[PDB]
Amino acid sequence: MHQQPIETTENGQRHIHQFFLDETLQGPRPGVLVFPEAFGLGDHALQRARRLAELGYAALAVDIHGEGREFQDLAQVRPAILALFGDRAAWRARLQAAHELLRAQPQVDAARTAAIGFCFGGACSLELARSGAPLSAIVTFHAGLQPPLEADAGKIKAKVLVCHGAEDPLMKPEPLAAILAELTRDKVDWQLLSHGNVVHSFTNPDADARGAPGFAYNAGADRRSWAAMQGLFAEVFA
Template structure:
């Protein structure tokens, strides 16, 4: 398997992503954008990109803060993502720049593109899809579920998979209901999987270090959610 840093820009900010692929695979492959949690591009997102590369995809783990910056504590990470929530255009420009950088790779099949994201990254997948980007499928893991903008109606072109901890206290029932209403209203091909006995950040082995009961790793939920994503990708891309 091969990997490298990938520099790209949205015109206002420079980013340093992590690109992974299997150099033994011939021809153009489906491309998957991996959007990390609020802390930024760390080992968690790179390892998921490596997993996807081993499965035959070309994966780009995105830099969400610019210049490869990685927040060291939860408070500063939350402050950074709150700024993006307050400026949806800038938030979407960050995601679009990463998506465009992935689709521009010579070994990527531009007709077979997807995105996955974790926590804030999962929410960002929804923001990307709401721009009308040519993303065929998105899979979000323990994502926040924010409301769309009025002008987003009719834009989503992707199949949508949400993997959610059934005991996640950070995502309110009202947000889940509003998300489901959006999916039904837009006639999206969507799935919402509740993982029992599971809270937020269930794919992150180091989640307990945050010192709050809302964050905890759950290996069975991680394995099952990844399998659900792989099944949907195989269905969508017919990847081998």
């Protein structure tokens, strides 16, 4: 396993992304962006990127806040997140730049990429798909997805898998249905895997200790969603 930091600046702020490649497999391979939960890049998302490398992918874990920062409370990151939610064009320009940074690594086959994300990271993955980036697939895990925009009609090129806790308060039934209606109008190849009795942050063991409501780890939902991701990637990268 090779783990390499990849540094950029964004309006002068240093970002330190973490790129994983397993030398067990030989030659260029599909690239996967891994977007963390809103707290920022930490062990949760780094472990996901390391495992994707073990499965044969070149995985770029995204430092969303800069300086590899991971915060403890969503209050610490709320202003930065609301600023992105309030300027989706600027957010998307940053997301497309991360995609181009992944594509440019020598061991990444620039034609074969995907994006996964957890929580806010899943919102990022769908915004990047809606920008029209040439992703082969996206997978979201317990994501609070942003609402559809009519200007994005027909832009998604990826296959889409939404892994969802049926009781997650951050992705309520009516807004989720509005998103599925967008994907259906545009004939996007989409799947919803909805887990009974599961809420937000179900892939993160630290969710059981969070003081905010609606958070709990669920080992079953995590394993089943991770397997469905692997199956989608095996389809598009066969």
